[PDB]
């Protein structure tokens, strides 16, 4: 009775949102970007191969200096690489080897990791003793922690397998804000450039735009068919791209509140684990399960190129802040730098 | 180049420790412990977040990972166990109502693209409860599995001494339900190792060791092309 009434009201609201989106869909991104010249054949080649990890890499995050990157592999090691020289700056032994994510603080003083331990472990790289020690363990998530990104040295948004995202205060170790609303477990998060918002993709085939300070879900983006394993914010912050298991990458615009473009091909039947934009946002680099990374022209939905250099599943993909490089970690226990 | 040389020396020192830790990690055998709440998977070897059980058989250290503290949805976190030597699947063989749930879960694990290279050590637990359920006659497998009526005990069966034929037919039927799935897909890449175990069984650690030995031998032979 009451439940049926609420379900009918929810269906009416969903139809209202769908009709508003259809009314705002006068043209498509293909029509607008039809006259622009194609990017050509983007042929990136492996500049550096980082060969120190002895198990599958689950995630890699770049530092804001565009030189240092932290890599998380399921051997209990967080290796911080000097990507210019392939030097291992740090090798952090993890309490739980089942790490699924790693973050690199914009200041570079801290890194994060997490996974099946349900704990985001913050490691201080600038200790007075000269050795990296765990600074704070963030407990409170009741599922595997799938992604984490530092806003600063004291705040970090962590998305977990308990279908919730959490904003943490590292000094106190407490969830200052819990982001609820995803029915499926969240797999990735992408902080906006101004850090006032973040989009989270979950296994409910929906991506939700969250307000960090307010704590509510401002916009929910549907259109994917399967679990959204990857999410990445456009460099202007007005749009974002998702990667899913339905072998499609979809670009969602915040201010249009709907999907703009679908990046798929008929010969692609493998899910997308990682997505990342270039510095201009023109190239959408996406890692796939077919051991290859297809570079997508984000405005024209054309496969610009293929980053085929991994013998196992591509799990993570990261583009530097200056756009000079693309780091592609994978399950073959190697990270490759492409440009 | 003074600081550049120190960076390479630090990297070589770090890479040295990774090699040392990798050799230590290679001496450990990683196992995924899976099963329902009534499966009795916590009492197999008898030795928050993900729980780890460490047991050693014949100087070989096994790390059995029981993944508690997660939700009922496992399609994403089970991909973290792509490189485990074996998945230890424990089934409450006496609970007929959840046998199909165990079969569906086994079918998903067997056919998952990130678990199709992993042999499964199947434990058909609660054989003592299964024996007393069959002899009582109150609960019938044919109500939950109509093909059990047309099922005959295999000639390759090895009944325990003093075991009733109905109990032997029942437990081997449950084994063949999982073995039907295992033989239907995964051509020689991975194998199923079914074991009939009770709650008071003390040779499960040996059974895991014997199967893991078979898995690693087949993995080593597959690398050189022999298997």
């Amino acid at each position, epitope marked *: 009775s009451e439940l049926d009434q609420l*379900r009918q009201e929810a269906e009416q609201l969903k139809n209202q949102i769908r009709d508003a989106r259809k009314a705002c869909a006068d043209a498509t991104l293909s029509q607008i970007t039809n006259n622009i010249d194609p990017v050509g054949r983007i042929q990136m080649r492996t500049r550096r191969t980082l060969r120190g990890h002895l198990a599958k890499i689950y995630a890699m995050h770049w530092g804001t200096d565009s030189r240092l990157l932290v890599s998380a592999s399921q051997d209990g090691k967080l290796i911080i690489w000097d990507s210019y020289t392939t030097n291992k700056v740090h090798a952090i032994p993890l309490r739980s080897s089942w790490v699924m994510t790693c973050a690199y603080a914009p200041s570079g003083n801290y890194v994060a990791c997490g996974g099946l331990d349900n704990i985001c472990s913050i490691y201080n790289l600038k200790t007075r003793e000269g050795n990296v020690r765990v600074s704070r363990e963030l407990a409170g998530h009741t599922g595997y922690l799938s992604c984490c990104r530092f806003l600063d040295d004291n705040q970090i948004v962590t998305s977990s397998g308990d279908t919730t995202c959490a904003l943490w205060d590292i000094e106190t170790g407490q969830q200052t804000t819990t982001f609820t609303g995803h029915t499926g477990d969240v797999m990735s998060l992408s902080l906006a450039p101004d850090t006032r918002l973040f989009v989270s993709g979950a296994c409910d085939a929906s991506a939700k735009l969250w307000d960090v300070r307010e704590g509510m879900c401002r916009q929910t983006f549907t259109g994917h068919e399967s679990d959204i394993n990857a999410i990445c914010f456009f460099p202007n912050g007005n749009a974002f791209a998702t990667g899913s298991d339905d072998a499609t990458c979809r670009l969602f615009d915040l201010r249009a509140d709907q999907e703009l473009m679908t990046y798929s091909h008929d010969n692609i039947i493998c899910g997308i684990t990682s997505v990342s934009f270039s510095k201009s946002g023109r190239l959408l680099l996406a890692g796939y399960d077919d051991f290859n990374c297809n570079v997508w022209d984000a405005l024209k939905a054309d496969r610009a190129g293929v980053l085929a250099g991994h013998d196992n599943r591509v799990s993570c993909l990261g583009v530097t802040d200056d756009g000079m490089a693309v780091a592609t970690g994978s399950w073959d226990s190697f990270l490759k730098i492409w440009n | 180049s003074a600081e550049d040389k120190a960076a390479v020396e630090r990297s070589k020192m770090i890479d040295r420790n990774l090699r040392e830790d990798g050799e230590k990690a290679a001496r450990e055998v990683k196992l995924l412990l899976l099963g329902a709440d009534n499966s009795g998977k916590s009492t197999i070897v008898k030795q928050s977040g993900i729980f780890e059980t460490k047991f050693q058989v014949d100087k070989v250290n096994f790390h059995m990972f029981d993944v508690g503290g997660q939700r009922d949805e496992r*399609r994403k976190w089970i991909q973290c166990f792509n490189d485990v030597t074996a998945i230890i699947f424990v089934v409450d063989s006496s609970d007929y109502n959840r046998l199909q749930e165990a079969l569906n879960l086994f079918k*998903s694990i067997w056919n998952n693209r990130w678990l199709r290279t992993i042999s499964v050590i199947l434990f058909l637990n609660k054989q003592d409860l299964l024996a007393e359920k069959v002899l009582a006659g109150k609960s019938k497998i044919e*109500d939950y599995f109509p093909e059990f009526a047309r099922y005959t005990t295999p000639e390759d069966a090895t009944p325990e001494p003093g075991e009733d034929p109905r109990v032997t037919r029942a437990k081997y039927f449950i084994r063949d339900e999982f073995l039907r799935i295992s033989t239907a897909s995964g051509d020689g890449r991975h194998y199923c190792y079914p074991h009939f175990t009770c709650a008071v069984d003390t040779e499960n650690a040996r059974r895991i060791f014997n199967d893991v030995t078979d898995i690693i031998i087949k993995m080593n032979l597959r690398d050189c092309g022999l298997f």
Partner: nanobody
Amino acid sequence: QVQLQESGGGLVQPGGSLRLSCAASGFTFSNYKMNWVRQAPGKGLEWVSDISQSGASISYTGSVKGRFTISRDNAKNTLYLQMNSLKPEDTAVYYCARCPAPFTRDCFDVTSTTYAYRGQGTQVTVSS
């Protein structure tokens, strides 16, 4: 927006017949294996049947073998379940569950409590 809409459930006499329909939208229906799951009163979620992407690989749970006939129409994006010879233990909320990933032989988590690609369900009541 992945949306599964069950229909056709209702009060049915024991031994009666009841055809369920699952209107599917928001995904390519022909790329996914489709599932039927139960919700008995006071009991956990029970998988009933699955049908493959093409419709060739069909498996039922043993309690409904010989009685239930799952079928799909990829052209109409509809998943069917012909429930003949209905018994009182079949009184449950029947959900059509879609397997999470396309082109996959494995079908994970369709019987989970908070599964996403599963409809709101229809109430099938088999009573005298």
